[PDB]
Symmetry: C2
Subunit: 60 residues, 2 copies
């Protein structure tokens, strides 16, 4: 479900980001990941999924 997709998507995005130079991770990507994790912690897994799309559009 959305809860499962949210957790998997956070891991997926972080997997991609972990292959970037840390000094080249854009701030907007970090902000989007933290929004996704905030919404995940609030139980709003649908909003987590929407923040992950922002995060994916922030990847170089």
């Amino acid at each position: 479900d959305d809860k499962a997709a949210c957790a998997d998507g956070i891991a997926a995005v972080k997997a991609r980001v972990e292959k970037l130079a840390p000094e080249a991770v854009p701030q907007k990507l970090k902000r989007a990941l933290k929004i996704a994790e905030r919404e995940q912690g609030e139980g709003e897994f649908d909003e987590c999924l929407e923040a992950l799309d922002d995060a994916k559009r922030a990847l170089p």
Copy 2:
């Protein structure tokens, strides 16, 4: 708009609650108000409006 409705609704609910004995304010009403204020602070005014409905359904 929703931002305006959210702020007005928080004030309205608190106005009703301020006319209750503090020891008789139900915990679920407090929790709903704090969720509404959290979502307001996050800029999710539509979700604030939905938490206010929960708050209103919690009034004695």
